[PDB]
Design an enzyme around this catalytic site. Structure first.
Site, short mmCIF file in Angstrom:
data_model
loop_
_atom_site.label_atom_id
_atom_site.label_comp_id
_atom_site.label_asym_id
_atom_site.label_seq_id
_atom_site.Cartn_x
_atom_site.Cartn_y
_atom_site.Cartn_z
N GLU A 204 -1.38 -2.17 1.11
CA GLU A 204 -1.75 -2.15 2.50
C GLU A 204 -3.10 -1.45 2.65
OE1 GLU A 204 1.10 -0.06 4.87
OE2 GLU A 204 -0.03 -0.31 6.77
N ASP A 206 -5.22 -0.08 5.56
CA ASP A 206 -5.28 0.22 6.99
C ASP A 206 -6.71 0.49 7.41
OD1 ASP A 206 -2.42 0.01 7.49
OD2 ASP A 206 -2.15 1.87 6.48
N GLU A 209 -6.41 2.51 12.52
CA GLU A 209 -5.23 3.03 13.21
C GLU A 209 -5.76 4.07 14.16
OE1 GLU A 209 -2.77 3.81 9.34
OE2 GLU A 209 -1.29 3.03 10.76
N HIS A 220 -3.58 2.13 0.87
CA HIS A 220 -2.28 2.50 0.33
C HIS A 220 -1.96 1.54 -0.82
CE1 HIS A 220 -0.49 4.72 3.97
NE2 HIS A 220 -1.56 4.16 4.50
#
Ligand SMILES: *[C@@H]1O[C@H](CO)[C@@H](O[C@@H]2O[C@H](CO)[C@@H](O)[C@H](O)[C@H]2NC(C)=O)[C@H](O)[C@H]1NC(C)=O
Ligand SMILES: *[C@@H]1O[C@H](CO)[C@@H](O)[C@H](O)[C@H]1NC(C)=O
Length: 430
Positions: A204, A206, A209, A220
């Protein structure tokens, strides 16, 4: 799961742009699809709930397999039930619509196929308005290693596919998914929403956010980049007992400018002034400057009122720079005293492997039943000194962000993403 028929599935249109060089972009006619978990699941033959409140109906779903053969993901009324509207190149997610809370959407290449992005040696850029996102909300735009077809070619009992938003996975190995790998999550289903025995893991990235108070960019990695099933507490992540038991890094290597000690960079009235729209640019650099190289650095620029403003430097003792690199990630875990699960699951080299597999664009608006989004915008481990490095991530009070509060007080919160552009480094802006 089967494809449903009560409500027809019509994907809202969304344009974005692929560029080859600055000022030289071509518009693509994309669309978005709602994730399978927000949908009404009904039996294939009538219009009866296979899923009722927080429980499986055993007449239709006596086991994982049978459930999947008997039950169908219905189409979605995007505007009226889920508060999703698109205009041209812009997508608006409303927080609370009736009894629906939030949404998760994937960008489609066509009506049965997720758009795959190969991010190495590329840059991704988008405009965003987070001015109507208070404490406790997360307007997320990120990438996961999902299958382009949503699992259909691997799993014969998944007859719905990307068209109905199947195949989700992220670094938390979520066990709240009603359907994984062409099977329902019924055996082991423990009601709270709810969690089951099976989870869905993948790498993942990101990219964003955020709310109006704080933001973070956070890769991640996972041992296997790309969608994997896990089971029980071995999943790790938010829902399992031990966060760090699984094959994915649940924390990741994060850059939140507030947490890194610059509290005047991002927020209302700040350098990036979140009362107005701005542009977020993210570059994915490789060691050798080519598409086949190892991921080595992630860089960030913002644009507000045609001013180009780079990510601020870390102001944490012994942690240096304004970009994510192996060096940065190692130094920041040490200086904050967090377990370095990032490097245990292969760090940026393994984030890069996932980027080579191709990744799916997710846009999302959610609140956080587990941790109240305090890891993003407050002092996180709440039982801890807010002066020690890494505790403070934003100005929100520690009593903020409980779902029943924010859903009742700020139902007309929303996030708007627009003007998505993708291309070689320095092609999406000047
Ligand atoms: C927080 O970050 C901002 C933005 O990087 C810093 O302001 C910059 O400071 C440098 C010197 O290090 C100047 O050359 C830039 O022109 C500044 N940018 C702007 C637009 O102000 C600021 O110093 C940081 N503040 C703290 C609290 O450390
Ligand atoms: C992108 O532009 C920046 C200056 O804004 C420069 O540091 C970098 O070399 C450029 N990258 C490429 C590969 O053109």
């Amino acid at each position: 799961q089967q494809a449903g028929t009560a409500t027809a599935e019509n994907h809202p249109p969304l344009t974005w742009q692929e560029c080859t060089a600055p000022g030289s972009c071509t518009t693509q006619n994309g669309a978005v699809v709602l994730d399978a978990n927000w949908r009404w699941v009904h039996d294939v033959n009538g219009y009866t709930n296979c899923y009722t409140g927080n429980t499986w109906d055993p007449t239709y779903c006596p086991d994982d397999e049978t459930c999947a053969q008997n039950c169908a993901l219905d189409g979605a009324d995007y505007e009226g039930t889920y508060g999703v509207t698109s205009s041209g190149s812009s997508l608006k997610l409303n927080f609370v619509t009736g009894s629906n809370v939030g949404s998760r959407l994937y960008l489609l290449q066509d009506d049965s196929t997720y758009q795959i992005f190969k991010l190495l040696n590329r840059e991704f850029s988008f405009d965003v308005d987070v001015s109507n996102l208070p404490c406790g909300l997360n307007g997320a735009l990120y990438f996961v290693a999902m299958d382009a077809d949503g699992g259909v070619s691997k799993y014969p009992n998944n007859k719905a596919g990307a068209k109905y938003g199947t195949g989700y996975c992220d670094s938390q190995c979520p066990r709240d998914l009603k359907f994984i790998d062409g099977e329902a999550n019924v055996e082991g289903w423990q009601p709270s929403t709810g969690i089951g025995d099976h989870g869905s893991c993948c790498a993942e990235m990101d990219v964003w956010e955020a709310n109006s108070i704080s933001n973070a960019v956070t890769p991640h990695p996972c041992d296997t980049p790309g969608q994997t099933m896990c089971s029980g507490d071995d999943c790790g992540g938010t829902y399992s007992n031990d966060r760090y038991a699984g094959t994915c890094d649940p924390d990741g290597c994060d850059f939140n400018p507030y947490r890194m000690g610059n509290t005047s960079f991002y927020g209302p009235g700040k350098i990036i002034d979140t009362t107005k729209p701005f542009t977020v640019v993210t570059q994915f650099l490789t060691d050798d400057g080519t598409d086949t190289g190892t991921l080595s650095e992630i860089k960030r620029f913002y644009i507000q009122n045609s001013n180009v403003i780079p990510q601020p430097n870390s102001d944490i003792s012994g942690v240096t720079g304004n970009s994510i690199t192996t060096e940065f990630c190692t130094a920041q875990k040490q200086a904050f005293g967090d377990t370095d699960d990032f490097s245990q699951h292969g760090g940026l080299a393994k984030m890069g492997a996932a980027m080579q597999q191709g990744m799916v664009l997710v846009m999302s608006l959610w609140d956080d039943y587990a941790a109240q989004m305090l890891w993003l915008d407050s002092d996180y481990p709440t039982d801890a000194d807010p002066t020690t490095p890494g505790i403070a991530r934003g100005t929100c009070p520690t009593d903020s962000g409980v779902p029943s509060d924010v859903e009742s007080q700020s139902p007309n919160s929303y996030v708007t993403y627009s003007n998505i552009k993708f291309g070689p480094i320095n092609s999406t802006f000047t």
